[PDB]
Amino acid sequence: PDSLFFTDGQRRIDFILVYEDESKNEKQKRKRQAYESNLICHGLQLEATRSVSDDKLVFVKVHAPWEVLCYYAEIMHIKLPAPFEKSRMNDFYILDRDSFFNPATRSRIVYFILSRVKYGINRLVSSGIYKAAFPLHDCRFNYESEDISCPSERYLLYREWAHPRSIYKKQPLDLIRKYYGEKIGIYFAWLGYYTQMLLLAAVVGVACFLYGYLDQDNCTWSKEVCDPDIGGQILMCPQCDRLCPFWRLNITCESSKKLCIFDSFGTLIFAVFMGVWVTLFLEFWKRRQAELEYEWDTVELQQEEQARPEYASAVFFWILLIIASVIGIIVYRLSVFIVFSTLTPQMATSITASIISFIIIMILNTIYEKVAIMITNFELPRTQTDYENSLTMKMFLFQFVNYYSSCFYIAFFKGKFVGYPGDPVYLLGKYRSEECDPGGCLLELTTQLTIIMGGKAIWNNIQEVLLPWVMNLIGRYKKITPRWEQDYHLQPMGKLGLFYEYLEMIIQFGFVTLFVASFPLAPLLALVNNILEIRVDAWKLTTQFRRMVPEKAQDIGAWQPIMQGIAILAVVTNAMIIAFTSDMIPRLVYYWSFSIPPYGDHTYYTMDGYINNTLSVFNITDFKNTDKENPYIGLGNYTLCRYRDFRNPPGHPQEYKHNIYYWHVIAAKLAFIIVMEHIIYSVKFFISYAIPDVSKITKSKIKRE
Amino acid sequence: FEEFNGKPDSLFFTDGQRRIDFILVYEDESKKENNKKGTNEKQKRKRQAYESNLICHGLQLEATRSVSDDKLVFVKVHAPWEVLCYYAEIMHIKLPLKFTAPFEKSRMNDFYILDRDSFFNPATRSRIVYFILSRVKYQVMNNVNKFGINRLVSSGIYKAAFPLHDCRFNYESEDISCPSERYLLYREWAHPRSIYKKQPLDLIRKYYGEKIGIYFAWLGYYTQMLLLAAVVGVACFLYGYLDQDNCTWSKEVCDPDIGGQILMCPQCDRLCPFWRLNITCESSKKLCIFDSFGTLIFAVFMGVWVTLFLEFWKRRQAELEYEWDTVELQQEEQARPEYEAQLCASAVFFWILLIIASVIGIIVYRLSVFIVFSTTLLTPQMATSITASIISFIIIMILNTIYEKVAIMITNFELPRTQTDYENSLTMKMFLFQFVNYYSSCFYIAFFKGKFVGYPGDPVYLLGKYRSEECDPGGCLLELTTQLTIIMGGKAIWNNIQEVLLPWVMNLIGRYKRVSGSEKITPRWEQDYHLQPMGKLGLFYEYLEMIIQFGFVTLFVASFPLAPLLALVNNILEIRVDAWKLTTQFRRMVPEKAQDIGAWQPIMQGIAILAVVTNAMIIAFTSDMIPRLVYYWSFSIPPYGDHTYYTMDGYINNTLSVFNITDFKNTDKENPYIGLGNYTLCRYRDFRNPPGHPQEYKHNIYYWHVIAAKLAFIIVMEHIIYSVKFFISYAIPDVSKITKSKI
Ligand SMILES: *[C@@H]1O[C@H](CO)[C@@H](O)[C@H](O)[C@H]1NC(C)=O
Ligand SMILES: [Ca+2]
Ligand SMILES: [Ca+2]
Ligand SMILES: [Ca+2]
Known about the structure:
The structure is a homodimer.
Chain A: E1 16-20, H1 26-41, E2 47-50, E3 57-61, H2 66-75, H3 103-116, H4 121-127, E4 132-134, H5 153-162, H6 173-179, H7 182-214, H8 220-226, H9 228-232, E5 235-236, E6 247-248, H10 253-262, H11 265-295, H12 314-340, H13 345-378, H14 385-412, H15 442-477, H16 483-489, H17 497-514, H18 522-543, H19 559-581, H20 584-593, H21 610-614, E7 618-619, E8 640-641, H22 660-689, H23 696-703
């Protein structure tokens, strides 16, 4: 029959208690008998039926008297499924007296009852007193419930919103909350809204990328780099000790042509726009949260305190943060070194280096999870909410360092403080500092970013869910037991599933927002990943996991401080990326200052001769001040080689010292940082302050009273 | 009604059992009516109607004729038992218990009730009576209800309406039962003889209500924090003062063999000759005093101090709201639209006017300097700077009143929904106007003086014949300090003088307008009617002046370490100045309640945020510390210098640029220099390449080195300061432990 009510009875179930008989020592059987007797004496129904599939396992089912449900609903501030009170029974309109109450709310009430009972229930399950304890789903998602009376909410919800065939359809948040709970509803609403404006972000990013694409022909510096008469004649200095000869500059046409796309004014405009996009996202999210708070039953007060089975060292945690950053940096460096120590070839080398780094990061993720779990366990938090808050902070910090250490190293600490060939810098001793090509390391940063984002999202989602679905696709293209048994055969989501999904989404948000200057197409990947992830989460939650008790919440949780922190960090990170990682500022300075007779020779501002007039000159006879073993010995009759640094030429009164152009460029970079930082923060403050005159609709809705 | 019995200080009715609450004053028809008689009879009819509704609502009233002027009639008021209790219930007035509840007639026995008249203090009784008089209606026309005591005075129906003081401030009440709180307040709080005693905020709150007690508590806390800042700033200034023989650059300037031999280059076009650098020895010494590392340390400490001040003010505010058990009435909030009343164009117009206000500020400073300098032909330069600052300050004070009037006009043109909206709009507009008016000259000196003037060969003219002004080799920091100190001192002095005098002189005119030889005893109400009305705005101007003072203290503390000391002295005087003026020369304000100071708190937070950037900019650009450090660390060394080790020797000569007189291009005024014909080259304050050279007069590597150092300093200092402020704000729990325990 697979009925939802009591067998041959008119009564609705809200939990199943399952145990293993001690008869295959009697201590466990006696303890369970005492616990069950206490539970029965407290005033709850019970019934035990043997499972046909397994004789050892015997399941126990419960019920819910109407009087107890009403009394406990009136116990705390609960509105219609305005505190409830039996003295005001007829005040609320009723369609039916025996089934009107939402089954989700009934399940939550009985969950509270079980939590308060002691012999306990949670510890009994943990220690093996009960094998499991869970509520029941409405029906099988495969087909409509046999019981015609049942609404079959699971089937309708699955077909409408969980199956991929409804990928394009809108999110039915009302059924989601009325079935699962407020936590799932708010999570999915936030995800949908996030995708909603990621659409606009992706459109703007695509516009900027296309604008960069249509300007390949006019990208003068790349053309000069390619022209053999200009690029080929320039002979660059060696970049390493033993595994590099003098190399012509024009070997980088592909690199320069690809870099000119991601190093144009379009990226600057996109970063500036994202600066205000972040604050618009925040402010509209507060508007939407207020609207949901008004429309939903989210004005119910929270318990003063809560129970937990479990009732300085902060420095030790920070030392682990430093070690995590260091180990990430060496992981990336070693990967690139080993791959290099053997059109497409160099690009493929970078791709495989990034792939290896991403793999190492993926393995390190599990170790970071485990160490965070033990370290937070050692603290013995007094309550639960603080436990989730501590997990959020510590896990977010570990993931942040583990996933952004390599990106930050590439953006800032690669080629920034390498001395001239005469006196190279060995920071740690016998460990030379890496230096980028004349264009810069922005393209490498973009490659690392895209590889990490793709790999993470794709591998995670695919490997975790798509297996049965891909099997079904392959098949298409190329006895019965009651509900409790089937539900038991499922697996539970634990207690951190929503936490893990939020962690994924926050790492995704950090990737899309922090380093947006390097990769303007990141929001498009964000949009695709979220469009898939929403349905992936819905399908997995409604198919492969046991039903979870609903909970009450008004905000996403502890992640909003991380949102604001990420925004304030992203503005400065983008400013520094544009200033230092990109070479836009030096070329603008050259255009406006070093193409005029005092320094240049052209009759008007132009980009001509930027490559020739910017590269420095080095003399081999001054190979080192120490006059020790050298790589420049022999290797042809070359006399002068050029390097990517702003320094005076040989023979100058200030030999191999930073020249006027260096300081002009540094001043321009710092001025850009200051102006962009100040303007962006001023605009963000103004936009936030413009709430009353822009989004007054929901505030008026609240003021309806 | 009935006439005066004869007891002057009696605050009761003639019977002696009913406590007066308000005095209503109206002009009787006994006057020789002129103009329109219909207006007079309508006025009378409205008066009887209002009195009829007031008595119907349950207020006992009686009148009396003034002893001297038969044309004035005073109408008393009283709040009987049931109405008092009922309205206390309606407004949720909290009363002493002995978990917490307002006062309701259902729970009379649950409160510490000793006597009806004693259970409700006179301030609360007057507040209740004011609410009754405001809510009560008198007459209706055109299907619209018209009500409010304010409307009657606005239309001239009533001359005034006010509570009464306990007794004369300087004399004890003749009534033995009278507490005479005014006497104690005058002896202990006002009357500066108690210049040092900690003011009793509890009695102030009891007498004048929360609205005044909160302001005075804020002022006291401000004064204490100012004491801390003043001590630290004095320490920094003293450290700068005691280290003078080590200020090498000023010694070089004063040395006749270095500063004397440097023939500087004329600043103006032709009205000033060449000059030698040694004539600024005194200015160099003063700058050594006011431009040391102590100034930087104090700027950092003040960046910390503003945050500590704000956080501890939040803690004190929490403690005070709990202590004065104002939570219930704070929650009880109702808004009534203004009874006087019955598009971004106005906003943009106001913004334009603000821009012009700044423009006149700059022009006034520049013109004062111009005239003082033109009149030419302790130190004459110091005297000239002081004079220019004096005229600029005078014009600023003149413009202050005009700006107030225009702000009132602008806010009146708009129709604020209620009194609170009007107050907030006026606060914002007045603050912007005063900010611009007072700080325009200071910002000009700091940032736009001697900053974008080219080399002497090609001077920069803004639009023709308006040559940009330039500073001396030391800089304009001393000029900015002089302007700031003059403005601050003059503002404080004039405000205190006007505050002390104007009510007093107006009261004296009021008294002398009664030359009739009374020389007798008069009742409380008649003599209290002669006091000034203390117009509806209230403490708005006091808060405004204190906020402008806060702006002066914080924004420009990188140039004047002694500003907190001036502020401390001013506030130490202002406590008693305000107390005396409120207790001696004004009618009793109607008590009311407020959560905090009000709309000024956002202003203070914004000023605190802006102070960091303003101070960083001042130290980076207005001062010359950054060039000094750059020379010490990177140009006294053999790559560019000749000294073996880092030193500041030779900074003056190696930094000053060179210019050849004959290289003056342009055919206009071909005799700027050749008239004197003394030498062939001059020195000027700018970093440019010397004559000859591939880039003859273009900015050199030193210029860009210095600019990069300045920008890096700005970035580093601002980021560090803001992060530190965020960390302090996070660490502070925002509430005291004891208050958290009680709540
Ligand atoms: C670069 O320039 C050299 C010298 O002109 C040349 O022969 C080569 O074909 C050019 N292109 C590449 C990819 O090396
Ligand atoms: Ca997932
Ligand atoms: Ca004053
Ligand atoms: Ca005052």
